[PDB]
């Protein structure tokens, strides 16, 4: 790979000055280059890995989602005939997510995973393989659409396990994911009830929990849970 | 779209 | 070239959904693909290719300067010294931003400048070759910089000459070539006289020939004549 | 910085 002659401090460091440009395409690559290494990742370097992916995968669900909407659009009656090239694109910017979202599984495939055995990292890469497999079935349509959406169901139900079993109602990663998970539950798995439930759920017992916290966890936590407040609003 | 992290 | 098989219509066609989507990168691929097609560009294709470029390089022109910003500090007294890094990933910004100048300028050299001409297709083009020479003026500090700003200025003067001979005061062309230019000779000949008296004589003359104009070539006007007037503001 | 277009 091209970064293979990099050193890995490099690379991180790199990572971190490509954030800062605000150049994620080049922040992944970075990032990717350091995964590649073989060595396991720290909190920060997680982070920036998850940073990221999630900035270059989320413009092209943007990107994706104009176009598609173009496309549904061009398919209602009335519309006049403009010829193949709306889909051609659409597929080009699908084609190219779906890319970056195997290369993201193949990191956490090879090895990432298989050598995460604390629960704030095992937890946080098994809600990212999750969220990947959630943006494939975003846009899946075939034969493999249940069983990809399975995936990312199977890869939250691991994390949301041990996250229960291993952290505190209020650690940052177990609100993460349980926000994530519901989202999954509302937008992918037709089952908005259990989307609610979770959100709910998870909200009343971080707030139960906050009063052991110093000011400093109490505002990582308090934010994520105004995102559960914030979807359990969009959705009530 | 709704809150993802 | 990789879009050497798609009909000209049709990347035209993608160009403008790849604009929806802000796919500046995708825009300009296609609009290079149209432009290599060999036949000259409409108002509406000109428009396009300049969108899309100037996306394309400002992004990079504004990721160069984050990065020059960090090299800078780090070559001050008392800063630590950190290696190659910020050096190297400013390099690699800087050596993407000089090949999309050179992709545009080839563009232009090969073969849309000498196939322009009425005034507003050669008056545009020649205003985007001075831009690009800019962008590469902004980067420049070697042998070949002087080089380099006198190329800048001489396309912007050849624009300068047709313009103020074949278009009214207030064509946006006129306008827009009028601010570039200016700003050159306040950013990169180290002329702010030059470009104060430049931007205060054009807006002058335009606000006099308002009267000759509909509504909507007013719209158009005015709003150009407010970004001359933003960099008086700024300058003065 | 200064207004371009
Ligand atoms: C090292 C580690 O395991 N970390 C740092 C993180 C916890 C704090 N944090 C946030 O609170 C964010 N992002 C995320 C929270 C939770 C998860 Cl699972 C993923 C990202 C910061 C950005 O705004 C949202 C909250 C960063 C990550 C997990
Ligand atoms: C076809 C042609 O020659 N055109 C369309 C343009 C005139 C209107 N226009 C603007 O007013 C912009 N952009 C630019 C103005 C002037 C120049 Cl030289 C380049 C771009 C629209 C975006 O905001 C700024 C004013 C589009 C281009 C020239
Ligand atoms: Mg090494
Ligand atoms: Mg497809
Ligand atoms: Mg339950
Ligand atoms: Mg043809
Ligand atoms: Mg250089
Ligand atoms: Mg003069």
Chains 1, 3 share one sequence.
């Not at chain 1, 999750?130 to 943006?135: I, V």
């Amino acid at each position: 790979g091209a970064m293979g002659s990099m050193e890995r401090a490099s690379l991180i460091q790199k990572a971190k000055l490509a954030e800062q440009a605000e150049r994620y395409e080049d922040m992944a690559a970075f990032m990717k280059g350091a995964v590649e290494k073989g060595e396991e990742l720290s909190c920060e370097e997680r982070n920036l890995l998850s940073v990221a992916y999630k900035n270059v995968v989320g413009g092209q669900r943007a990107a994706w989602r104009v176009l598609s909407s173009i496309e549904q659009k061009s398919n209602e009656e009335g519309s006049e005939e403009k010829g193949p090239e709306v889909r051609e694109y659409r597929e080009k910017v699908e084609t190219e997510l779906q890319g970056v979202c195997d290369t993201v599984l193949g990191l956490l495939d090879s090895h990432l995973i298989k050598e995460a055995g604390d629960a704030e990292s095992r937890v946080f890469y098994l809600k990212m393989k999750g969220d990947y497999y959630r943006y494939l079935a975003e846009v899946a349509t075939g034969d493999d659409k249940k069983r990809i959406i399975d995936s990312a169901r199977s890869a939250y139900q691991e994390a949301m396990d041990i996250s229960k079993k291993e952290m505190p109602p209020t650690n940052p990663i177990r609100l993460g994911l349980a926000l994530n998970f519901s989202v999954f539950h509302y937008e992918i798995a037709n089952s908005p009830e259990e989307a609610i439930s979770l959100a709910k759920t998870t909200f009343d017992e971080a707030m139960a929990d906050l009063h052991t916290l110093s000011e400093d966890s109490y505002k990582d936590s308090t934010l994520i849970m105004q995102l559960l407040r914030d979807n359990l609003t969009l959705w009530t | 779209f709704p809150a993802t992290v």
